[PDB]
Amino acid sequence: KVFGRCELAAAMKRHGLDNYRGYSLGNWVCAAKFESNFNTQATNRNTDGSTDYGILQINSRWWCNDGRTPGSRNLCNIPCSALLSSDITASVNCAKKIVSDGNGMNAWVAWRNRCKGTDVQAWIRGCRL
Ligand SMILES: [Cl-]
Ligand SMILES: [Cl-]
Ligand SMILES: [Cl-]
Ligand SMILES: [Cl-]
Ligand SMILES: [Cl-]
Ligand SMILES: [Cl-]
Ligand SMILES: [Cl-]
Ligand SMILES: [Cl-]
Ligand code: NA
Ligand code: NA
Ligand code: NA
Ligand code: NA
């Protein structure tokens, strides 16, 4: 599923990501934009053999099981495939664990490089939320 901008903002708010660990909704929308262009089916192979999945490009080294990442963990206790669903529940629940891990949203390198410090509210501007 490719979400619209306000459509994803609303879904993220419904699942309790708005101001989760102090990160406003615009932060999450921005991160999704640059991770996946709002596409739940986005996948990206890493040089290390891990793969990133879904709207927030969650990695198989730590967070989900894909059966092909040697030595990895599955801290969110999910098959990585659940991260590709039109239902963002599994993506959101897993992102809450990731953002709680110590480094906040810096866990998403694209958030640090493209969203951090910017006018992230622009991402929810205009939306009925
Ligand atoms: Cl957009
Ligand atoms: Cl915001
Ligand atoms: Cl497996
Ligand atoms: Cl594995
Ligand atoms: Cl594990
Ligand atoms: Cl599994
Ligand atoms: Cl959803
Ligand atoms: Cl933080
Ligand atoms: Na994701
Ligand atoms: Na894994
Ligand atoms: Na999901
Ligand atoms: Na950018």
From Swiss-Prot:
Keywords of the record: Allergen, Antimicrobial, Bacteriolytic enzyme, Disulfide bond, Glycosidase, Hydrolase, Secreted, Signal
Name the UniProt record assigns to this protein: Lysozyme C
Active-site residues from the entry: E35, D52
Cysteine disulfide links: C6-C127, C30-C115, C64-C80, C76-C94
Species this chain originates from: Gallus gallus (Chicken)
Gene behind this protein: LYZ
Keyword Signal applies: yes
Residues annotated as binding substrate: D101
Molecular function GO labels: beta-N-acetylglucosaminidase activity; identical protein binding; lysozyme activity
UniProt GO cellular component terms: cytoplasm; endoplasmic reticulum; extracellular space
Family to which this protein belongs: Belongs to the glycosyl hydrolase 22 family.
